[PDB]
Design a protein that fits this description.
- Chains A, B: InterPro entries: Ribo_III_sf_archaeal (IPR038133), Ribonuclease_III_archaeal (IPR021568), RNase_III_sf (IPR036389).
- Chains A, B: GO terms for molecular function: ribonuclease III activity.
- Chains A, B: It holds the Pfam family Ribonucleas_3_2.
- 2 copies of one chain form a homodimer.
- The first copy, chain A, is mostly helical and 125 residues long.
- Chain A has one domain: Orthogonal Bundle (Ribonuclease iii, N-terminal Endonuclease Domain, Chain A).
- Chain A has 5 helices and no strands.
- The first copy, chain A, has helices at 5-27, 37-47, 61-74, 80-88, 101-121.
- The longest helix of chain A has 23 residues, at 5-27.
Chain lengths: 125, 125
């Protein structure tokens, strides 16, 4: 596996905070909503990043995305405010729709993963 | 003393992030966890703040504690850094034990609730 369990756990707490802060500003009122695992997987596949995953990790696409986010943040490659703005600019009214929330959140996270993956690669000397 | 669920949900995301940052430094490696509702309720009663609400508002003790943290952070009464330090100073290994984590996490958050509560009164009154 290429997934560090610790990184994924840290990433889970981080992305939920970032998403809830983006949702709070988007709606103009304090709120929160747990990021579904399926939304993270949907984002990883939309960006094409899931094509680099080994078989052993195919059922853990969400954990992979979480660890990616955690790694970028711990290295100082992306700030809280910048992540929030990226998410917010892609949020839609479907965010308040249980029937379409999984897809909607995944769509809003896809651009964040692209930016994060690009910065990690560009950090290498 | 009001218990707005929206504010509680935001607080849940915020406290999970702050707690995961503290746990990460306490363990010396990237990790995370989610604060159980029961731990927040225990913290509230340990501080004795659970005296404010009613006997019927007992099922909302955890949510009330969360909402308080969110209110303080949103108002700018406490920073991420300071909240993380308060938590870490009160973390113990029992936090890693699944059979004792419930009470252990409540013990670590009690001091934070005390400070926040004092700042919410010493300012907003």
């Amino acid at each position: 596996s290429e997934i560090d369990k610790g990184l994924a756990k840290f990433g889970d707490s981080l992305i939920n905070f970032l998403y809830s802060l983006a949702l709070t500003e988007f709606l103009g009122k304090p709120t929160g909503d747990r990021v579904p695992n399926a939304s993270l997987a949907i984002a990883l596949e939309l960006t094409g990043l899931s094509k680099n995953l080994r078989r052993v990790d195919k059922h853990a696409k969400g954990d992979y995305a979480e660890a990616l986010i955690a790694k970028a943040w711990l290295m100082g490659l992306i700030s809280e405010r910048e992540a929030v703005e990226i998410i917010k600019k892609n949020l839609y009214p479907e965010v308040l729709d249980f029937s379409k929330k999984k897809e909607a959140i995944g769509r809003a996270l896809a651009p964040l993963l692209v930016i994060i993956s690009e910065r990690l690669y560009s950090s290498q000397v």
